[PDB]
Design an enzyme around this catalytic site. Structure first.
Site, PDB file in Angstrom:
ATOM      1  N   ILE A   1       0.826  -1.204   0.000  1.00 38.91           N
ATOM      2  CA  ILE A   1       0.000   0.000   0.000  1.00 38.91           C
ATOM      3  C   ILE A   1       0.862   1.258   0.000  1.00 38.91           C
ATOM      4  O   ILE A   1       0.658   2.158  -0.811  1.00 38.91           O
ATOM      5  CB  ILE A   1      -0.904   0.070   1.256  1.00 38.91           C
ATOM      6  CG1 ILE A   1      -1.790  -1.176   1.350  1.00 38.91           C
ATOM      7  CG2 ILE A   1      -1.751   1.344   1.210  1.00 38.91           C
ATOM      8  CD1 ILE A   1      -2.880  -1.251   0.301  1.00 38.91           C
ATOM      9  N   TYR A   2       1.818   1.311   0.923  1.00 37.87           N
ATOM     10  CA  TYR A   2       2.707   2.459   1.060  1.00 37.87           C
ATOM     11  C   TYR A   2       3.484   2.783  -0.208  1.00 37.87           C
ATOM     12  O   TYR A   2       3.459   3.920  -0.685  1.00 37.87           O
ATOM     13  CB  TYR A   2       3.695   2.243   2.210  1.00 37.87           C
ATOM     14  CG  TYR A   2       3.103   2.380   3.598  1.00 37.87           C
ATOM     15  CD1 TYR A   2       3.929   2.432   4.719  1.00 37.87           C
ATOM     16  CD2 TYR A   2       1.721   2.463   3.796  1.00 37.87           C
ATOM     17  CE1 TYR A   2       3.400   2.565   6.002  1.00 37.87           C
ATOM     18  CE2 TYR A   2       1.181   2.596   5.078  1.00 37.87           C
ATOM     19  CZ  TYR A   2       2.027   2.646   6.174  1.00 37.87           C
ATOM     20  OH  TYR A   2       1.504   2.776   7.445  1.00 37.87           O
ATOM     21  N   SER A   3       4.173   1.781  -0.745  1.00 40.91           N
ATOM     22  CA  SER A   3       4.974   1.960  -1.948  1.00 40.91           C
ATOM     23  C   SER A   3       4.171   2.600  -3.072  1.00 40.91           C
ATOM     24  O   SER A   3       4.594   3.595  -3.650  1.00 40.91           O
ATOM     25  CB  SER A   3       5.536   0.616  -2.419  1.00 40.91           C
ATOM     26  OG  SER A   3       6.406   0.069  -1.449  1.00 40.91           O
TER      27      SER A   3
END
Lengths: 218, 218, 218, 218
Positions: free
Chosen positions: C141-143
């Site tokens: 999600i972050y990437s």
């Protein structure tokens, strides 16, 4: 079909008796291309040339010390006269108790000079081909080499496109099946089917993620 | 030869009635591959399918609204049953008085969701193929989309490699001969000859230099 | 001196009661800046605000659910009226049995929308400041979030420079001393001393090399 | 405060009589740092040193031809003895009818060698400082230089971190207010406040977008 055909395309590959260079000669020869290669050791050359003709591969070669100016000039003269002043492909394949500064700078620059000069000695043949293609195929020392070559590659591509000359750089994997399998990417990039591909700096690395975040070679 | 053969490889291409998708269907069909595609307009589908069979291309299709969950689930069920539970290639081809925040976030996320979900609905077929391949083919809105997809692409590649699933992302040129010519790179990446290529995010841009300094899309 | 002074600069920091946001409020407050922050939990807010005033920090706040449109509009109205229609700094600090596609797309887009909208609600105050500054501070999600935000950041920077609005994105380390120490880079980027710095996407990662080859987050 | 203080930090800056180097000496001297610089022209040195002392700047210098091995060894010996065997900062500032291959390779390698060697001649002083910092501050020729230096920078950072030695590379803008304003980023990177920042290759370029797509120097 014709878009993915390398048939009768003239190719100059430096250091074609081993590693990636030998794999590149095989790959292009597999597509029935006409290749000229070089090597310092005349025995390894004739040795590779022999095995090649016994496979139906059309490859010629010469004993050149690609690290010497007069040698690079002689090599390219030998290429022009045999290909009739036209060259379709140029594969700048660079060659391979701790290294010092002089050695560090000597190896990185020597590689760049040789590559930059060979590209200039081939320009006329490439441009005359109508569909010129150049590919630069090449720790500590290596990495800095990469960064150096990637820039030159993209610089040239941004300079010889009007002459119809494309230029790309390809790097072997840092982490993985042989690393020499990259020869097929080298071949594709030179195909008419890839005429719009230029200025690319590709490293076929296994890549990796940490906790879900990507990480790759620079 | 066999390394550069896509013969009888099953392919799912979304949005195959126009632009890049249509070009991708043609490219793969040119290599005699078996393709299934989709489109919201059943008339444009049958329209493209007709022209294709008259060219010897083996392509089937279905009316799917790839933006809807149940549609993506139905599409993949239609793919499995026709390919026998195995899928070699998956081409996540995303579709196309100023946009607002809701529209900006709605378009970027919808694209990512659809792509992320279709990849999950195809996993079992891909893994069962033994040589699974996925390629994500896709200003302001677009750029942010790119950044989003490039990450997911590299993330998945760093997650399904053991199942033999490779994943790469390809972007059309920002500056140039048709942009649809990129279909050949898409095809090559899915070839067994490119089995070691994964996690790549390639944009075939014309590129440019300023006073000698390179500059390219991010 | 004056070039490295943030004295009396008005700052809007979202999510300032914890993690990076709290560290950013402290950093800017350490430089004697005037900050307004927000949080959903009115108890944690008053709780942080109290501890701050007992340190000589000039910070005010409001209970905003930055994920809601009307909340973001109310927050910015509260900021304008208290700063007199001018805002120097905007710190878009995004907030934090496996995630599905809907959740994946919902979180990535919600983050982007909130950030994209807050930037638009602040534009007039920023532009009116004369020296506007925006910084977007934010696996799997972050990437994808990163890739998305980096693009928007560089896009905006390439759009509001004439209004004197600079925009940069900063990411915490993936591999290391607290990750919240990055607040000092955030502060420097907003200093007049860094007025020429815009369009940068910086991740202060520990980085790493393999056999001598570099490797870093994308 | 102490985190953003360069007070009494010993600095070696090469080529400090002009361009970026002179700006870097001024920036660090503005923060009351103790600097030693060098230059081939002893008149320009004394000339700059004079103007500096009349500003309260504590800078000493020596006539060194940083392109010569014995000169670099002499320079570093002069630095150690005056700083007591400890050096906090090292600013590798490289110096500046068409260039040939020999000149191309001679300039790119000479720059890299000089930088790589000076870093090694300074290591002991840096490591002994406890908080060592190195920053490499440096078309066609330049670009390839950049790529080369960026790699070395990240390589070293991935090698001397345990000794507490951080390394970063900074590049001036390709497109814009003076380019010498980048001296403030150079200073910040060396601050204790930026101790966690290493392996960064930053180019403070104006950047640009096309139809909404970002584009920046590589």
């Amino acid at each position: 079909s014709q878009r993915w055909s390398l048939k009768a395309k003239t190719v100059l590959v430096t250091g074609g008796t081993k590693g990636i260079g030998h794999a590149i000669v095989e790959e292009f020869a597999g597509f029935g291309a006409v290749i000229h290669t070089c090597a310092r050791n005349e025995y390894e050359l004739n040795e590779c040339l022999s095995k090649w003709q016994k496979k139906g591969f059309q490859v010629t070669g010469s004993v050149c010390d690609a690290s010497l100016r007069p040698e690079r000039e002689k090599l390219m003269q030998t290429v022009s006269s045999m290909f009739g002043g036209k060259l379709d492909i140029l594969i700048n394949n660079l060659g391979a108790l701790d290294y010092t500064a002089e050695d560090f700078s000597f190896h990185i620059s020597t590689n760049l000079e040789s590559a930059y000069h060979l590209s200039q000695l081939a320009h006329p043949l490439l441009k005359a081909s109508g569909c010129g293609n150049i590919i630069f195929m090449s720790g500590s020392i290596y990495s800095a080499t990469k960064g150096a070559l990637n820039q030159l590659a993209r610089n040239l591509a941004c300079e010889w496109a009007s002459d119809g000359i494309r230029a790309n750089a390809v790097a072997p994997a840092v982490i993985a099946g042989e690393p020499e399998e990259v020869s097929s990417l080298v071949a594709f990039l030179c195909m008419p089917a890839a005429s719009y591909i230029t200025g690319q700096t590709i490293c076929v690395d296994g890549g990796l993620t940490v906790n879900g975040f990507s990480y790759q070679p620079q």
